[PDB]
Design a protein around this ligand. Structure first.
Ligand SMILES: OC[C@H]1O[C@H](OC[C@H]2O[C@@H](O)[C@H](O)[C@@H](O)[C@@H]2O)[C@H](O)[C@@H](O)[C@@H]1O
Ligand SMILES: OC[C@H]1O[C@H](OC[C@H]2O[C@@H](O)[C@H](O)[C@@H](O)[C@@H]2O)[C@H](O)[C@@H](O)[C@@H]1O
Lengths: 659, 659
């Protein structure tokens, strides 16, 4: 079960099953233990009021691939199939199931979120017969209870060469904010005269279906595909006509062309890769972490991943600093154009951040704790993070500057980076208060350690303000512009304190409390305000005892690991690398939950930090404060014989580490 | 677990659990295996387009009892309770759960669909603690995905003596056809000054909650109740205000008064009962059947039960001949005022039946195959029973005449019976076709055996037409009005044909096909057109093996039982009695599914049938064609020592049978 490219499950157990996702950064499809079904489908960029939090959310969408298959009268179910297996090929995001039906046929089905066509999905079904049999195939378009005012359509698009049957639905998100259209068709190899007639049934208020029968003789293979397109008014003004147009298009491109395009784009993604010799389980795990970040992001866009990417409704689909600090750094090293999309998401919401700042009495741009379509604040109001966790504004500025450092694109710095850095720094200049002693303070925040609420001088928050003001000043110099001299004066006197045991104090009320996740330790990495190895070690040893086993998210141990690799302590780095995700795993695909023993995968934020422990920690790779990627001292786990990181930085460098 | 009054389950197993229902003929609440939750709630009379069949349906409603209980911050879960038991007390429809929380406290909760107040529910909670502790109690009002455009309110109703905190939700059925209001409050014993402060949270789009803490001292019992009122625009013009009014009212009546009234009404229902000696399983099973009918009906109304009563969304809540022929006859004998509501339902829908006949080119009234709010046809269009299964009209007439036979109420005959009998006979007079031989045919129907579709001269349909015409004529005689002599001429010449072996032919195309359910046999009972014992017997011998084991509903073997009891064949009567329901049971409460090994309880139609096998078969009780209840020869199961039937007919007779 440790193939380095594939995740395998024999005989799915529906009582203990967490499905895996295929996605193209726009549509995610989460697997079902049941054959020829999907559990959930999510469309990026489509938000409406729905359940959790009383604020916008991703919306469960059409399970557009759901199919029912019958042989010689008899419905294929979990209960009457044998040798059933599922597999995720991470090389191309193919999810495959396969089974035997009695004495009649082997069935294999593979589905894909087509990597070049953001709104298109394809399933390919192969029937190999051991006896003569007749199949009945049905594709169902059930309108999920999250949508309303559905309409169920069917038509034939024809010319002399083709008969393309379209099963279409149109419906609305709960408040009517977004109109969703889905349109499906079957592709056959045999051509218009010989293809099965397609029947259409509309027997329920919330479900219609298209269906056909086909006689297959013993010893033959019969194939067909299902193509579906899924789009909304958030993506295009006329989703109904756009859905049908895209499914027509894809049908006339055909399976072969579509898959070849899919494959070419996946191949390009895997040109940046991490290879580990001597530890197959690590190898597979790290490939799964890469796979998920590649599936949940998309070059050449303004999309940014939620903490759970497209694996479901985790955190409502909202964007957090989980992007900037956790998922963004490994992507920026491996595929900068992905990082470009993530920061583009913020650039386009700068005006919304300006608006927040004005509503809360500050200058500049105040990015929201949680962000969705507009870029306004979308945190549930019962969570004090929304009003008071303010580091996110500095987190956005850090990643913007980092983009510049790694790409050296001064054209992007002038047009997009500087507007961000300038406005965020104007926010911090307005956010601080000078005291009698000439120090600057930032009072009344929720810490990165979110258990500490309405406290003063949070170490991490204070550190991001310092960085934000310093990077905006560095950027003004790059661009030949005059920065407010106040920005450096402030950065230099923002308070960061130590306790009497010589440990960095997390906040002004901090003595010895348990903490939710890493905060003071983040000044060592990523912020690198603390670079004295003794201080790093003092702070590690103190805080590593303060994280409880329960209810603490995977935004911690990866950092411990990373700093221990930078201090060249192999055993401890490897201990914290495993502890970061292994306690969080869900069967049968080793997906990652947010917290230890949790049941809410897939926490791509978690994957993002572990990838940093691997690349920046074991690989010793580092964004150089002066430009590009450098390599610092590192160690490997004892049992890893070789680590190979490919496609790094704009020179696409390969790094090989050994003992 | 064979208490004759109580159904009981130890340690509910959620992987194999079919909940039991409490109901007052208006609201039904179906149990959850989870402590202090309910699975589903259904309000009678509220219909909208929703899922199955693309036609009107009962809607899942607010799970208004749902409660969360914590002890010093620790919520109750499966893994921290023990000695968890559930019980349904059939004497008063009380559903009770009980459990122990760790070794700290014991908890019981009993809930009720209050019998006298159709729109009000009550749950009483009792907590006995060993040590000092603090409880947190939350009542959650989650808007189900079946409803839309919800609003979540909370307010305090006060005077010098009380503070009634109301948690209210108002929402709409899928098309906006019905507006639903729910309003809950907590009742305390301790009085306004000492009662807990109630907090309100609205943290989700689709859920709000009211909560309180309370300190309980070591060795003391703390008791509180939750009252809920659930009502719609189908029942009142202003449900929002009526729901709050009703809960205020119930709150100031108080628990004690509310339960006393409930008990009195249940006590009356059980004045008609069936007692079996020598077979405890039978006794419990039969009580369960009576309980479900009593719970799923209501005297002094125009309500009629669906095939699944208020147990869920079975057959979309629609009314079928399952009332008139299956549920109605035991209710007529035991509690005629329940039968009076069932036929009232048809009386107030006579104009819609006249409209149906006109639209399908017939005279008089043509009752729909499936009925709901208006009395128009509600059968899903994909089912040819809607257009072609016409015997329903004669089934309505039969029940209307029986009502008169049993009660002797000639004032009702004039006002309500005769309108029905006259219009329904006018239908049949227009529905027959005379042939060259002077016989009357009824062509192109779906048979009671619904596997026979678009066939001629169905036995059961033809018999219901004869009976309809005869009984209309007799009604005319009683009332002194002139009936068409054609009714009698047509009745006496409607075709009922024999095969060469002398067996009643099901329809003109019938030879030896398997059949879905009893049809020719129904001519013996209930119609009594076949009285000759050798004919009854030859029809039984031919047809009894024609019903397959699978996918055949519980509308067959109860009739075989009854007929064998009338033929004085104890072994066969008892064989069919058990076969009618025991292969259809689901755990842990022995609820009845529609079919053998099915999974869609509670099929109240199948219970009605069995209750006829017991009352009319084993008890020998019969509606006398001349008026009243008579008794014919019968036999008991060998192992039954005594069968006692109480509350029969308008004189409330007790029948006792022994070997
Ligand atoms: O989506 C809202 C909010 O959810 C998570 O936080 C909930 C509360 O958790 C506690 O740990 C913390 O003490 C509070 O400050 C939080 O409101 C999430 O961690 C948070 O980032 C989200 O905004
Ligand atoms: O509510 C619709 C319909 O449901 C059930 O019938 C479905 C089909 O069942 C077959 O067995 C039969 O041959 C057909 O005539 C039916 O349409 C139900 O039995 C029926 O009464 C309902 O009207």
């Amino acid at each position: 079960h440790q193939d380095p490219w594939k995740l395998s499950a024999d005989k799915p157990d529906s009582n203990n099953y967490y499905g895996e996702t295929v996605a193209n950064g726009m549509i995610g499809i989460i697997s079902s233990p049941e054959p020829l079904k999907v559990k959930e489908v999510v469309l990026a960029g489509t938000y409406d009021i729905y359940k959790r939090g009383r604020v916008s959310s991703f919306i469960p969408n059409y399970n557009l691939l759901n199919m029912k298959l019958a042989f010689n009268g008899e419905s294929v179910q979990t209960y009457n199939i044998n040798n059933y297996k599922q597999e995720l090929d991470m090389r191309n995001g193919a999810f495959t199931g396969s089974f035997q039906f009695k004495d009649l046929a082997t069935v294999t089905y593979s589905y894909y979120a087509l990597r070049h066509l953001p709104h298109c999905i394809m399933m390919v079904v192969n029937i190999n017969t051991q006896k003569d049999t007749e199949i009945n195939v049905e594709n169902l378009l059930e309108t999920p209870s999250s949508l309303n005012n559905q309409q169920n359509y069917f038509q034939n698009i024809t010319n002399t060469h083709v008969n393309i049957p379209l099963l279409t639905s149109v419906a609305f998100t709960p408040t009517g904010r977004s109109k969703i259209a889905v349109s499906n068709t079957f592709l056959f190899d045999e051509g218009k005269k010989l293809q099965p007639e397609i029947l259409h049934r509309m027997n329920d208020a919330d479900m219609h279906a298209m269906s056909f029968d086909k006689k297959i003789k013993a010893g033959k293979t019969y194939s067909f595909a299902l193509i579906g397109s899924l789009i909304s008014s958030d993506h295009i003004n006329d989703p109904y006509n756009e859905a049908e147009r895209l499914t027509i298009y894809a049908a006339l491109e055909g399976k072969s062309r579509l898959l070849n395009r899919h494959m070419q784009e996946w191949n390009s993604l895997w040109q940046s890769d991490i290879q580990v010799e001597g530890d197959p389980q690590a190898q597979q795990d790290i490939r799964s972490m890469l796979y998920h970040l590649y599936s949940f992001t998309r070059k050449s866009t303004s999309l940014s991943p939620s903490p759970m990417g497209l694996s479901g409704l985790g955190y409502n689909g909202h964007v957090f600093w989980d992007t900037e600090i956790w998922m963004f750094p490994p992507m920026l090293l491996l595929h900068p154009e992905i990082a470009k999309s993530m920061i583009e998401y913020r650039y386009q919401r700068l005006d919304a951040a300006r608006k927040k700042a004005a509503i809360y009495g500050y200058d500049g741009a105040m990015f929201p704790w949680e962000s969705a379509d507009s870029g306004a604040e979308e945190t549930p109001v019962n969570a004090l993070t929304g009003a008071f966790e303010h580091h996110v504004t500095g987190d956005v500025a850090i990643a913007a500057w980092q983009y510049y450092l790694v790409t050296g694109d001064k054209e992007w710095l002038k047009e997009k980076g500087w507007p961000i850095l300038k406005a965020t720094a104007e926010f911090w200049a307005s956010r601080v208060e000078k005291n009698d002693k000439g120090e600057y303070e930032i009072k009344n925040v929720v810490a990165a350690d979110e258990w500490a609420e309405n406290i003063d001088n949070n170490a991490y928050t204070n550190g991001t303000a310092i960085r934000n003001l310093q990077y905006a000043s560095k950027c003004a110099t790059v661009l030949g512009v005059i920065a407010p001299k106040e920005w450096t004066l402030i950065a230099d006197k923002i308070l960061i304190s130590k306790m009497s045991n010589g440990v960095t104090r997390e906040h002004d009320s901090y003595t010895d409390q348990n903490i939710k996740q890493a905060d003071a330790n983040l000044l060592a990495y990523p912020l690198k305000l603390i670079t004295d190895k003794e201080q790093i070690e003092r702070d590690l040893k103190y805080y590593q005892t303060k994280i409880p086993q329960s209810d603490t998210p995977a935004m911690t141990q990866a950092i411990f690991s990373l700093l221990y690799s930078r201090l060249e302590d192999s055993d401890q780095a490897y201990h914290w690398f495993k502890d970061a995700y292994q306690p969080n795993l869900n069967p049968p695909f080793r997906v990652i939950s947010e917290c230890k023993g949790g049941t809410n995968p897939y926490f791509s934020t978690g994957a993002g930090g572990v990838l940093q422990a691997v690349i920046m920690g074991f690989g010793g790779l580092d964004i150089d404060a002066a430009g590009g990627i450098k390599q610092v001292k590192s160690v490997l786990p004892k049992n890893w014989k070789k680590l190979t990181i490919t496609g790094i930085g704009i020179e696409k460098k390969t790094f090989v580490l050994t003992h």
